[PDB]
UniProtKB/Swiss-Prot annotation:
A zinc finger (PHD-type) spans 11-79. The atypical PHD-type zinc finger recognizes and binds histone H3 trimethylated on 'Lys-4' (H3K4me3). The presence Tyr-40 instead of a carboxylate in classical PHD-type zinc fingers results in an enhanced binding to H3K4me3 in presence of dimethylated on 'Arg-2' (H3R2me2) rather than inhibited. Belongs to the RAG2 family. Disruption phenotype: Mice are viable but fail to produce mature B or T-lymphocytes. Very immature lymphoid cells are present in primary lymphoid organs. These cells do not rearrange their immunoglobulin or T-cell receptor loci. Double knockout with TREX1 does not show a visible phenotype. It is found in: Nucleus. Maturing lymphoid cells. Changing residue 48 to R: Abolishes binding to H3K4me3 without affecting phosphoinositide-binding. Impairs enzymatic activity of the RAG complex. Zn(2+) 2 binds at residues 41, 47, 73, 76. The lineage of its organism: Eukaryota, Metazoa, Chordata, Craniata, Vertebrata. It comes from Mus musculus. This is V(D)J recombination-activating protein 2. It comes from the Eukaryota.
Length: 82
């Protein structure tokens, strides 16, 4: 019984150039069924954002999902010039 997308969910804007949208999205991860494995950042304002949206690997997401791991989004992994 997969939950459709009637109400809100992870269909948001992980970034300013996000493309994740059920209108044309699908379960890419092998551990997922029909939803983007969003990730939480730990830099000042922790937020939620898709993983593939930042050119990430499915394995790294699994490893980072082990529990204890300083996970960092893409816009806060190497802040310096922009
Ligand atoms: Zn996104
Ligand atoms: Zn972040």
């Amino acid at each position: 019984g997969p939950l459709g997308s009637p109400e809100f969910g992870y269909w948001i804007t992980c970034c300013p150039t996000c493309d994740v949208d059920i209108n044309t999205w699908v379960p890419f991860y092998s551990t997922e069924l029909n939803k983007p494995a969003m990730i939480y950042c730990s830099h000042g304002d922790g937020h939620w954002v898709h993983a593939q949206c930042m050119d990430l690997e499915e394995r790294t997401l699994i490893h980072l999902s082990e529990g204890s791991n300083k996970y960092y989004c893409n816009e806060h992994v190497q802040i310096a010039r922009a």
